[PDB]
Amino acid sequence: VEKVFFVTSPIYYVNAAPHIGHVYSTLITDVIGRYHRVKGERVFALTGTDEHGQKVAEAAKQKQVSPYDFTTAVAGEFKKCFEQMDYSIDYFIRTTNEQHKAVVKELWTKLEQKGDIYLGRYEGWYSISDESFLTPQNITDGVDKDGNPCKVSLESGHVVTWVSEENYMFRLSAFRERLLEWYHANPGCIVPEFRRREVIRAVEKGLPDLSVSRARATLHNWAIPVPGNPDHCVYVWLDALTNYLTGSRLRVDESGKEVSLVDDFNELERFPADVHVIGKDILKFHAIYWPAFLLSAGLPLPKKIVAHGWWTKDRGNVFDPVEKAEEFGYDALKYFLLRESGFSDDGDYSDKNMIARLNGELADTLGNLVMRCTSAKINVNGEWPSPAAYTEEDESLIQLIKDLPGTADHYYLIPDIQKAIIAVFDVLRAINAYVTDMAPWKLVKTDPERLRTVLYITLEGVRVTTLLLSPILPRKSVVIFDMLGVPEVHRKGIENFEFGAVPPGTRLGPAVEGEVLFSKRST
Numbered sequence: 229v230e231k232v233f234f235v236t237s238p239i240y241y242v243n244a245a246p247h248i249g250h251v252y253s254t255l256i257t258d259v260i261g262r263y264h265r266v267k268g269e270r271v272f273a274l275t276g277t278d279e280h281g282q283k284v285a286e287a288a289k290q291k292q293v294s295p296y297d298f299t300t301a302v303a304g305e306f307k308k309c310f311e312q313m314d315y316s317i318d319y320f321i322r323t324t325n326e327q328h329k330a331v332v333k334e335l336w337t338k339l340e341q342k343g344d345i346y347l348g349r350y351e352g353w354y355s356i357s358d359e360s361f362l363t364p365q366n367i368t369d370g371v372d373k374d375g376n377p378c379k380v381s382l383e384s385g386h387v388v389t390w391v392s393e394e395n396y397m398f399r400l401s402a403f404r405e406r407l408l409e410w411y412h413a414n415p416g417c418i419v420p421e422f423r424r425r426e427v428i429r430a431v432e433k434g435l436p437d438l439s440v441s442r443a444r445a446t447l448h449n450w451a452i453p454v455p456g457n458p459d460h461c462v463y464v465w466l467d468a469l470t471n472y473l474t475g476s477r478l479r480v481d482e483s484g485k486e487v488s489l490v491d492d493f494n495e496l497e498r499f500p501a502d503v504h505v506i507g508k509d510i511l512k513f514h515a516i517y518w519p520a521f522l523l524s525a526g527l528p529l530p531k532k533i534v535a536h537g538w539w540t541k542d543r544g545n546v547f548d549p550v551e552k553a554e555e556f557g558y559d560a561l562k563y564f565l566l567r568e569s570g571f572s573d574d575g576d577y578s579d580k581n582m583i584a585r586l587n588g589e590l591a592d593t594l595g596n597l598v599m600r601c602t603s604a605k606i607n608v609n610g611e612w613p614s615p616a617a618y619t620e621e622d623e624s625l626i627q628l629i630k631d632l633p634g635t636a637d638h639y640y641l642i643p644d645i646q647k648a649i650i651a652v653f654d655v656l657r658a659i660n661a662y663v664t665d666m667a668p669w670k671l672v673k674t675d676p677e678r679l680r681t682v683l684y685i686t687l688e689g690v691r692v693t694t695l696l697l698s699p700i701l702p703r704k705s706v707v708i709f710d711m712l713g714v715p716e717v718h719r720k721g722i723e724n725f726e727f728g729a730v731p732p733g734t735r736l737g738p739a740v741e742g743e744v745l746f747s748k749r750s751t
């Protein structure tokens with residue numbers, strides 16, 4: 229089934245200015261999207277802001293300004309930030325968008341018509357900061373912004389409060405068995421595996437029905453009214469998850485503004501998401517609530533949910549993304565964030581370690597290799613030479629390069645971006661050691677014919693690795709390709725994953741008096 233490859237980030241609460249967590253989540257979305265574009269697939273990548281709810285309304289209240297003005301302002305900051313981060317996102321959705329609201333109401337009506345919504349009560353704990361319902365097992369003792377004793381969430385340590393309200397309830401309990409059938413029949417649907425196991429365990433234990441409306445006073449009337457009942461507002465999370473369906477149905481102009489909402493998602497061939505990128509803190513909403521709603525409404529389920537080790541949202545200790553990018557570089561910062569962390573919080577995020585990787589991997593491994601195989605001193609004719617016969621050592625390197633695209637492909641599709649970067653750099657380390665071994669600088673004098681072969685393999689190794697790194701180093705890959713003089717046509721497509729796609733005789737790009745890809749940093 230050829231559809232548009234649909235990849236999403238979460239939509240972020242606009243209670244506060246954007247920070248590194250949002251940038252990280254959206255980066256992963258952007259990288260996956262970029263990889264599928266380089267394979268020559270159709271891609272629609274989605275991000276945005278989650279604008280309704282008690283959390284957000286109370287934050288605007290505390291800034292003494294109207295929700296409308298506050299949300300618009302903060303949304304603007306998210307956009308400026310993401311533009312400044314040089315992503316390639318196809319659309320930025322806001323839950324205040326009038327077309328999104330219509331989609332929420334269509335979905336709600338579908339659920340109601342299906343018989344899965346009834347009027348009941350929620351009497352239990354709620355976390356406003358998480359907009360999450362909690363059972364007594366999931367709270368404990370703590371302190372508020374005062375220092376008075378209170379109950380806090382085990383999930384997140386945020387203050388909880390007791391809620392007793394007549395609410396519309398979704399019959400989530402009825403979806404236990406179907407969700408279980410789904411997890412088992414599609415064992416790649418939640419990544420990484422240990423989070424998939426968490427979800428199954430939780431659903432095995434049983435599911436209560438879920439409150440999908442709240443009394444309007446509680447939400448400071450900042451939410452979507454329930455269809456046919458204006459005394460209730462729709463649960464911010466049902467509203468928010470629906471952004472994925474909304475975005476799948478929006479025709480967007482070349483300026484990035486929405487211009488039209490189609491009736492049927494199949495018209496745009498995006499829905500369901502191929503990959504929802506999320507943080508570990510919002511797994512239940514995406515892997516339990518969302519599929520249950522979709523099953524109720526009769527919509528198709530997502531293919532993969534990937535939950536990274538950071539928190540979607542959190543917190544004298546700062547790490548500004550634009551500030552580190554101006555200091556160290558945008559591509560380098562991105563590389564670091566994707567290289568340092570797997571599916572875990574931990575990871576040395578110090579300046580010390582950022583410099584170690586910049587200098588070690590980007591400068592000494594990658595950049596060193598690019599300069600050497602393009603240098604006037606070694607590549608005396610500034611072209612791709614024609615290879616002479618290959619030794620066994622030559623072929624061992626060629627084999628590594630030939631296998632690399634298959635290996636990196638699989639990693640990108642898990643998706644495990646860290647493992648893909650590590651694969652590419654294993655191959656770059658090999659290319660270096662080959663070059664050390666062959667000493668092509670010595671060959672210019674001694675064996676020009678042997679140099680052709682060595683030089684050709686090196687150039688092609690650098691081209692292939694660079695192509696596979698182009699989703700991670702989008703600007704630098706262009707600079708590298710320009711230096712190698714790679715024609716535009718050979719800068720994407722699975723055709724160009726093959727060894728030898730650029731023919732001998734291709735001319736290198738011009739140089740510049742002083743010119744470094746990644747310049748090293750002091751300590």
Ligand code: MET
Pocket residue numbers: 237238239240241278468469470471510540541
């Ligand atoms: C449908 S994704 C919603 C994510 C939520 N606004 C958060 O910041 O965690």
